[PDB]
Structures are given as structure tokens and as C-alpha cells.
Amino acid sequence: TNVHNTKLASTSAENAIEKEQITTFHDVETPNRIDTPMAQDTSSARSMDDTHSIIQFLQRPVLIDNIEIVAGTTADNNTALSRYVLDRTNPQKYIKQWTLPSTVLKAGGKAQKLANFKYLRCDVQVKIVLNANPFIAGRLYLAYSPYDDKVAPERRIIYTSRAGVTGYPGVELDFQLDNSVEMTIPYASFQEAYDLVSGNEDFVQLYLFTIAPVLGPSAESANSKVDLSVYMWLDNISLVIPTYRLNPNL
Amino acid sequence: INLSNKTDENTISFFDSGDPERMNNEALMRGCGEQIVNLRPLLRTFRTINDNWSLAANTKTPITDLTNTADAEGRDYMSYLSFLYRFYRGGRRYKFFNTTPLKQSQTCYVRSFLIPRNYTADEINTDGPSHITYPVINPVHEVEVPFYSQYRKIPIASTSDKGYDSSLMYYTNVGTQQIVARAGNDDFTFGWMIGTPQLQGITKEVAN
Amino acid sequence: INLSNKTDENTISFFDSGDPERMNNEALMRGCGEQIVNLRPLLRTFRTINDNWSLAANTKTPITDLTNTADAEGRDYMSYLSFLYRFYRGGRRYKFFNTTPLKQSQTCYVRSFLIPRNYTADEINTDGPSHITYPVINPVHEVEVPFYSQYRKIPIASTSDKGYDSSLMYYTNVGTQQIVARAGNDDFTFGWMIGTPQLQGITKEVAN
Amino acid sequence: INLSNKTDENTISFFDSGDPERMNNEALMRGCGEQIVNLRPLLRTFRTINDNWSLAANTKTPITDLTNTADAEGRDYMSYLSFLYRFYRGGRRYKFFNTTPLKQSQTCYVRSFLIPRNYTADEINTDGPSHITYPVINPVHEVEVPFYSQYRKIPIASTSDKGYDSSLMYYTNVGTQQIVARAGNDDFTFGWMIGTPQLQGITKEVAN
């Protein structure tokens, strides 16, 4: 019976059901396996680092945008937040807008790991690292508006006042006080999970407004400016249901 | 391998999911507010079988006139759920909401009597327990019919015997229109289960 | 009878014989005097791979020159037993018995260095640990090569990388002939088992 | 269903009947008065093999003359039951009832001797134990033959040896007729069981 390096053909139990992760094999009899006798782990990968999961991979910060606002510019990035908005041809100006959670699913190789999965529940974590020499001042407001693209215009963070914009959930971002701000955007869908295949829908828009423009010396200079870098990742993740389909958008 | 055609009765449930009872409850506490567990409650609800049933004046009209039509349609619960069963028992409830558009007499009144099923008004007396309403002060009749039967279960089929269970007569001294809603009493239930029929959906008359 | 193709795993041993271990021992105590139970001992024995390996004077000769030839032949244990396995580990031992028939210089000396495997003498320095012998007083070199590897197991196959384990250089100031016997150190062993190749037997060139 | 041809060894007895032993006994106590349970008792009963066996005067007649004929017929128990078996043992009993119609001598006597089976009267002496009767005072002989054998069982078949068991000689000084009834002694029994032969029934010679 006791032979090495081969498994001979034999009968076995007449009703076998082996369940791998999601595939379940039924066989008429128990398969005739050959495994390695007294197996070992002859590698060092488990000693180099820990094996990261998909939840860990999706928790990795990804650089989304790098902005550079210059002082003395009548551009939408430097022009400030307006007291009133009387018409839609004259809305509130913003530095950068982000459709979420798409902007993260389509970044850092996260779509490769979200592939072959149907439903998702996740919070979006945002970190902005700003840098401005001690002679530059200013103040930004990072706020998020849910369903801003799908909600009526009167209900949008765009097309409302400064006191309305700053009534939204956000972080005050001063150049000389808050060199860095963080923000957690919760799971914003009205449905039980994000559909990663059928519905390419976004549910929360992230806006970076300007309370006070870049205040620098009167003398024109290339140095009167600030540089931004926005990082994003996911948190409180749940990928559950497999699927053979993919979103070609991602 | 043994030459055999057998059944091992293998069952597989997917997805590594939680308890369906708990999740279903969580869902109903957020999107329904109730949990229907049985279909007799639907025999207690009142549903319309005709939203306009016109009648003639001084005419005793057996409601079989209408329920023989309604039972085949499948519009109300007492008809839709009757295609799953063969027997029934218990009494029935009928509500008649007045929708009479014209005034015929100074005093309009609605009156209801008993009648054996499948009888005609010319075969029965206007005696026994009755109920009278005045649509001007009370535009809803709300009569009930008990199970006055020779048998403990009534078949939804035809029979040799006749007049073996009670039904309703409806009298109006004037030509009235009615919303007719019906239901079963607190004892009505259907028999023992059978298969479903086909269902009729949308009809699209297209030019050829 | 059941229509079936099965295996009952029946085993039969003939002859009503005694214990094979006891009888084998009795036999070895009369006709062998020893009992080989493992093939690593054969990797410890020294066996010839070339009974004459001529060299040129003032030439650093990597012994791969010879072992690449020898490993394919199957003449020594380190080659015959390598066709059963895929991996190996540990160092190696080489003995060089002098068979030089002519006198070239008053003082003949043999010297050995290290060298990464599959390197050439023009790609490596003559530094590091060495061993020197004088064939006139000591006609046997008896050098040993440690396992100086980047990997815990070396495949008998080819690789992308090169110089990942150590080997031997052989230098003679004069043209010498050698009986080259090799073996493994007290740590050498082969990998994990595979099938056998064909064997080559007698060749009879016959006139047709 | 499994492809198989098997035996489940299922047995069914009909009729919800009582105990066969009790009912059989009840029946025998009303219609038989006895219960035959074995066939040796039938080897103890005396039955006729010839109801007239004529003999010549002053002639020693071995009874094989008659039993070789009788054993093939199947008329007596010792012959009918011999077709179920192959061996026999034990002695035999013979009764000779006189039916001689004529008077030959003033004094008629019957005498019986022993003789090895298949011998002739010219091959044996008239010595040994004998028995003599006088049919006028005793018309029944009632001799018995012991099992004087070289073998513990005698085959109903033929043999190479001869005279290996005893038999009977029969002598009459006058021509007598006899009813010949035979049986086995209290030790006679047949051998071990085999199959039955065919039976011969009625013969109807019809004119064609």
C-alpha cells in the first residue's frame, strides 16, 4: 500500500463534496490525491512582510491631485467664496472637484482588486498636505456635498451662499495653522451597497473652496504661491459577492 | 465505480451569509413596518370587486349576480387565493359604498337580507335577519353573512345540491351605484392546496 | 453480482517465509559485512570522474570544465544519483592524484582557489582561501569546497542567475596529469525524487 | 437503482394460519390414529415381493433368484426406498407363507440356510445355522438373516468382490408355492440420499 511519489487508482467513499473558496465539486468518489509527504515552506516570503488583504490594499493612500495656487490670479482656484449666488451663470468657484467614490476606485490599482466583485460598502478617507512658506497666508474650506450632481440646483453646494457652503460638513484649512487636514466621508449611498458593475453612480462630491485667497507680498514674485497634494483611500470596506462582469470605466 | 442511478440528496447554500430571519426583520423595520406571514389576513382585508355596480329600483338582487363574475377574474383576494384551493368555510363580509349620482326619492334606503346561494329572488322570502342603511347619513352598508351551511366545507366547484349555504340579497328603493368591497369574517378560510393557474398580463392591440 | 469496477486492495505474499529483516541480517553477516541503508553515504565515498585529466602550465582551470562533462555520463555517484533528483545542497570534495609522467620544473606545486560556478578564470581573482600541495611529497591534493550560496537549494538545471554558488579553480605551474575523484562534504545531499532515465549498456560494432 | 442481480432470500407464507404441528396432530387423532415420521419403520413392516413363488423338489434355491427381480420393480418398501439411496446395512427378514395346492409327500418340511450373496447353491455347503418348519403345523417360516459382512456398508450397485455378505438358501423336499414377504431386521437401514427415478403408472393397450 505504502508507495512513494505516486497515487495509484483505487476506490473511495461513494459521495464526495469538496468545497474550495466558492467552487464546490461533487465527485462520484473521493478524488485520488497525491500530496507532498512531510511538506515544508521553502520560501522566505512570510518572513519579509505580512500578506496584505484586499481591504488593506484599498486602505493604501493614493495621490489623486497636486494643485498649485498662485497669488494675484483671477482664476477659479484663487478667487474666493462669494457671499451670494443670485444666478447659475455666476456660481461658487472651487479649486478642484472630485466625484466619489469613483476617483478612488479608479486610482492606485484599486480597480484591479475590486474586479470580479459586485457590491461594495466603504468610507472614503481624505488627507491634504499643504505647504506654504511662513510669508504666505490664506484659508481654504474642504467640504463634501452628497448627491450634488443629482440633486436639484437650489440644493447644491454650488449655487448657494458662503454661509451655506460653510454650513456643509468640512474642514477649515489655514496655511499657517493647518498645514494638513483629514476628512472621513461616510458611505453615502441610499442603497445597501455600491454596485461596482451595473451602476457607475457617484453619491458624494468633494469640493475645495477658497475663503481667503493667497495673501502674499505686493511685489510680484513666483514664490507667492502654495502647493497642494490630495491623498485618498477607503475605510470600513466590504467586498462580498463575486461576479464575472467588470466595469470598463475602471 | 458502481453502475447506479441514485440520489444522494445533496444541498448547497451559497454566500456565507447571516441569518435570514434576522436580516429580514432588520429590513422590515426599515422599509415595510409589518410582516405578512399568512394569507387569511388578506381574506380579512376588504378589497373591491366592482367599483360601480348599478342596480334597478325596487329590485331584490342576489349578490351571486356579481360574485360569480368576480370569482373568475382574480382581482380580489377571495378570488385570487381561491385558485390555490378547492374548499372553503366561514362567512363573508360585504361593504357597499354609495356612488349614486342622481336623486330619485326624498328618502333613499338600502336593505339586505339572507338568501341560499345560487337561488333567485323569486325563490326566497324577504324574511329573516336584515340590515337597513340610509346612504345620505350612512353611505356604507357593512353587512355580514354567517356560515349557515349543511356542510362543514363548501367546494368552489359546482354541486348537485342547491341552497346549502347562505348568501346575500340586496334591495334598493331607488337606482343606486355602489363600490362593492368584500372580505371574509373572522372564521373564513380556504381549503387544501393545489396548483396555480396561468396569469393574464398586458394586452397590446397592434395594427397589423 | 453487482455491476461494478472497483479495487478491493488485496495483497498476497507467498512462501510461508520467515522475517525478511532477520534473514537479510543473517546473510549480511556471512557475505557482505555491512548494510547500506542510504545513498548519501555514497555521496561521501570518493569515486573517479576522470582517471587522467591533463592540464597546461600556468593555467587556472575551473573544474566545471570537467564536471559539466562528468555529470551527464553517470559514472560517479554524484552523477548517477543526480538523475533521480532535481535539487542539491552542500559543498563538495575533490581529490587530485598526480600522474604526471614527465619532469618540467625542479619544484612542482598544485594550488586551488574558489570560484563561482559557471564563471571563467578571466572573470575572477586569485584571492580568498587557497590550498597548495607539492606532488613530490604529497601527490594528493584533498581540497574541499563549501556551500557558499545565495540559495538554500541549487537546481541541477540551468538558471538565469550566474555565480550564485562557489566552485573550484585548479592551478599547476607545470603540465600535470591527475586522477580526479570527487565527493560531497558532510552536508551534501540531493533534492526530491523523480523518475529514472534510460541506461546505456554494451555497444557491439558489427560488420554488416 | 443499482445495476445488480442479487438474491434477498425473501420468504412468504400465506393464510394467517395456526400452528401446523398442532393442526396436523388434531387431524391424525381423528382420521389416522398414528403418525409416520421415518421410513425405517417401513423397512420393519413385512410386504410381499411375490404372492406365488413356485419351487422344485429337493432344490436349494438362493433367494437372490427372486430379490434381484424384486429390487428393480419397486413394489415393496425395501425396493421402492432403495432408489433414494446408494448404501445399505443390516440384516433382512423373510416370511414364506405356504400356498402349496397339491400333496406330494406325507411329511412336507421347509428348511433354510445361509449363503453369501450372489453365490450359487453349487458353490456353498448346507452347513451352519438353519431353520426348519413344517407347513402343515406351521405354514409360515419366519427366518432371519444377519449382517455377516466384510464391509460396514453394502452398495446397491455391482462390485468386483463376491460373497462379502450373507444371504438365504431355501430348501423344500416337495414342490411348494409361497407368499414371500420380506423386511429388514431391527438394524437394517439405507444409505445416503440421492434423487428419485421415474415412476411407471397405468398401461392402456389401445386398438389403433
Alpha-carbon C157 to chain mean position: 16
Instruction: Cell numbers for B103, please give them.
Output: 336623486
Q: Which amino acid is at D85?
A: Y
Instruction: Cell numbers for D95, please give them.
Output: 416370511
C-beta of residue C99 within 8 angstroms of C-beta of residue C168: no
C-beta of residue A144 within 8 angstroms of C-beta of residue A205: yes
Q: Per the CB < 8 Å rule, is C3 touching D3?
A: yes
Q: Interface of chain A against chain C, CB under 8 Å?
A: 1, 4-5, 9-11, 42
Alpha-carbon A204 to chain mean position: 12
Query: Interior CA angle at D152 toward D148 and D155, to 5°?
Result: 95
C-beta of residue A63 within 8 angstroms of C-beta of residue A109: no
Neighbours of C162 (CB within 10 A): 11
| Element holding D28 (H helix, E strand) | helix D20-31
Nearest to B10 among A22, A26, A28 (CB): A26
DSSP state of C104: -
List the chains bordering chain A where 3 or more Cβ pairs fall under 8 Å. Answer: B, C
C-beta of residue B4 within 8 angstroms of C-beta of residue D2: yes
Contacts of A15 in chain B (CB under 8 A): 8, 10
Instruction: Enter the resolution in angstroms.
Output: 2.8
Helix residue spans in chain B (DSSP H): 20-31, 40-44, 64-73, 77-80
| Angstrom distance (rounded) from CA C150 to CA A9 | 41
C-alpha separations of A229 from A55, A67, A182, A183 in Å: 24, 6, 12, 14
| Angstrom distance (rounded) from CA C113 to CA C171 | 8
Contacts of C1 in chain D (CB under 8 A): 4-6
Nearest to A24 among B2, B8, B12 (CB): B12
C-beta of residue A135 within 8 angstroms of C-beta of residue A240: no
Return the SS3 of A208.
Answer: strand
C-beta of residue A104 within 8 angstroms of C-beta of residue A200: no
Q: Which amino acid is at C8?
A: D
- Distance of residue B79 Cα from the nearest chain A Cα, in angstroms: 36
Which residue shows C-alpha cell 500530496? A35
- Distance of residue D151 Cα from the nearest chain B Cα, in angstroms: 57
Q: Which amino acid is at A250?
A: L
| Element holding B87 (H helix, E strand) | strand B87-89
Q: Interface of chain C against chain D, CB under 8 Å?
A: 1-3
C-beta of residue D79 within 8 angstroms of C-beta of residue D71: yes
Query: Interior CA angle at B158 toward B157 and B160, to 5°?
Result: 140
* Domain definitions of chain B by residue range: 1-208
Starting from the edge strand earliest in sequence, which strands make up the sheet with C92-98, in order? C47-50, C178-184, C92-98, C143-145
Which residue shows C-alpha cell 461576479? A243
Which B residues, 2 through 21, put their C-beta within 8 Å of a C-beta on chain A?
A: 2, 8, 10, 12, 14-15
| Angstrom distance (rounded) from CA C184 to CA C42 | 9
Tell me how the structure was determined: cryo-EM
Contacts of A241 in chain B (CB under 8 A): 15
The neighbouring-strand residues paired with B67 are none
The answer to whether chain A touches chain D by having 3 or more C-beta pairs less than 8 angstroms apart is no
Start-to-end CA span in chain D (Å): 61
| Angstrom distance (rounded) from CA D162 to CA D155 | 12
Q: What single string gives the DSSP state of each residue in C132-161?
A: EE-TTT--B--EEE----SSSSEESS--S-
Q: Interface of chain B against chain D, CB under 8 Å?
A: 2-6
C-beta of residue D20 within 8 angstroms of C-beta of residue D151: no
Q: Per the CB < 8 Å rule, is B2 touching A24?
A: no
Q: Per the CB < 8 Å rule, is C193 touching A10?
A: no
Q: Per the CB < 8 Å rule, is C152 touching A42?
A: yes
